[PDB]
Amino acid sequence: TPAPVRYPFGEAVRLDLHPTYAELRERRTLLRVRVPHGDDAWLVTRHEDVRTVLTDPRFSRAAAAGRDEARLTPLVIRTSVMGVDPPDHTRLRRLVATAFSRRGVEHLRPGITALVRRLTDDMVGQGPPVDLVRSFVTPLSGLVICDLLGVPYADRSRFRHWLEAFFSITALPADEVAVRIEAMYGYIAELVALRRAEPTEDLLGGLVRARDRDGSCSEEELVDLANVLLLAGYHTTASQLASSLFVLLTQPEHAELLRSRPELAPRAVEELLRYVPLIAHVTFARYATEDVWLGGTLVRAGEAVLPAVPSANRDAEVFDEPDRLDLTRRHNPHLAFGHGLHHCLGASLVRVQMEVALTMLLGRFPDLALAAPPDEVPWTRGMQARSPLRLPVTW
């Protein structure tokens, strides 16, 4: 194999993609790389190629649990349904699929709408400037994931310390990663226990009933599944909505487009998912289980592949002018939610939260503008997802 290049190519800066990704797409080759932790891997960068590795059966995600997973984090993270192949993946997803369907999530829109109203009610009285990350983006995603799952949002003062340890690359040392992670796995266990004595009318309550009277999941599958849903809803969604708000407030000709044309919103939400590079670098690695050829490379059974999803979302062979934001694109086959088997489970819930919050922010602050130069806005350094630390605005 070729000499392995360091990966990452550098810290992810704001929302800029490193130039090597585009050259790799043009080269039509995988790149053998050397990551901060785990085995070496092949970096995958073309929309066509990232689709193959995300979902082809010959590329396994279970096979990486019996390995020191190529990865960017110090510790291997438990990814629940995201770390298993079928039939374990089937068995487990079916337990949460109906709650996260488009029809299932449509019922949450009246209350998501009303929260966005109560949150925007408060910027009005508070007055500029407002930190949109603190006063809006985090209360919205944080209160909508906790109310669906059953986690007390009023418990955020203890478990949002622990959520950062799952997303750290260089922000925390590995000993502080290991300890916050077990703090979280013991807070989840607290909640599972409080519901065998006191059944709840929430997603966690229904998962505990599902392990107890059906045995449809082991107890660590139970606690992992619930650990991962609050991971994704409380922080991954806030990152994307905080970064989409950066893209509109710094390219303010697109905020003016969508504000004058709110019917664009479902298209505007999709393109903001294609165009924002939410994943700092790569998604979860897969290991070949037999020999697959792609990207001018015979990947042998047992080798890793790292899918660089943000790069696939700029593939000129799929997206006309992929580096220009076009909030009005009609067909958007982006991979910002994954592809095939592991396609993002809260897809519909991210969309609804994003349609509502963008429509009302733009509708209700028609001259909303950043209260700093775009480059004076601070960004998450060392983290697995990209996000602005604060987002001061005025109107």
CB neighbours of residue 326 within 10 Å: 18
Residue 236 binding ligand HEM, by CB under 6 A: yes
Q: Which H or E element spans position 286?
A: strand 286-288
State the residues that interact with ligand B9L by CB under 6 A: 77, 79-80, 82, 166-167, 228, 231-232, 236, 279, 283-284, 384-385
The pairing of beta strand 392-394 with beta strand 369-370: antiparallel
The pairing of beta strand 130-131 with beta strand 59-60: unpaired
Candidate list 45, 73, 135, 283; residue touching ligand HEM; CB under 6 A: 283
How near is the Cβ of 172 to ligand B9L at its closest, in Å? 12
How near is the Cβ of 114 to ligand HEM at its closest, in Å? 19
Query: Is the Cα torsion angle 285, 42, 28, 14 positive or negative in sign?
Result: positive
Residue 93 annotated as binding site = yes
Candidate list 72, 151, 207, 232; residue touching ligand HEM; CB under 6 A: 232
Contacts of 198 (CB under 8 A, 6+ apart): none
Is the Cβ–Cβ distance between 123 and 130 less than 8 Å? yes
Residue 380 binding ligand HEM, by CB under 6 A: no
AA identity, residue 273: L
Q: Which does 248 bind (CB under 5 to 8 A by kind): ligand HEM, ligand B9L, none?
A: none
Residue 278 binding ligand HEM, by CB under 6 A: yes
Ordered DSSP codes for 76-119: PPP-GGGG--TTHHHHHHTTTHHHHSHHHHHTTHHHHHHHHHHH
Task: Classify each residue of 365-384 as buried b or exposed e, where b means 16 or more C-beta atoms within 10 Å of its C-beta.
Answer: beebebbeeeeebebbeebb
Q: Which does 167 bind (CB under 5 to 8 A by kind): ligand B9L, ligand HEM, none?
A: ligand B9L
Residue 331 annotated as binding site = no
Q: Which does 54 bind (CB under 5 to 8 A by kind): ligand B9L, ligand HEM, none?
A: ligand HEM
Distance separating alpha carbons of residues 227 and 225, to the nearest angstrom: 6
Residue 254 annotated as binding site = no
Is the Cβ–Cβ distance between 301 and 16 less than 8 Å? no
Q: 342: exposed, middle or buried (C-beta count within 10 Å: 0-12, 13-18, 19+)?
A: buried
Residue 207 binding ligand HEM, by CB under 6 A: no
| Binding-residue pattern over the window 285 to 324 for ligand HEM, x denoting contact by CB under 6 A | ------------------------x---------------
Candidate list 24, 229, 292, 318; residue touching ligand HEM; CB under 6 A: 229
Residue 90 annotated as binding site = no
Q: Which does 297 bind (CB under 5 to 8 A by kind): ligand B9L, ligand HEM, none?
A: none
Q: How distant, in Å, are the alpha carbons of 55, 109, 148, 158, 159 from that of 151?
A: 31, 20, 8, 12, 10
Output the known binding site: 89, 93, 283, 286, 342, 344
Output the known binding site for heme b: 89, 93, 283, 286, 342, 344
For ligand HEM, the binding residues (CB under 6 A) are 54, 81-82, 93, 145, 228-229, 232-233, 236-237, 240, 278, 283-284, 309, 336-338, 342, 344-346, 349-350
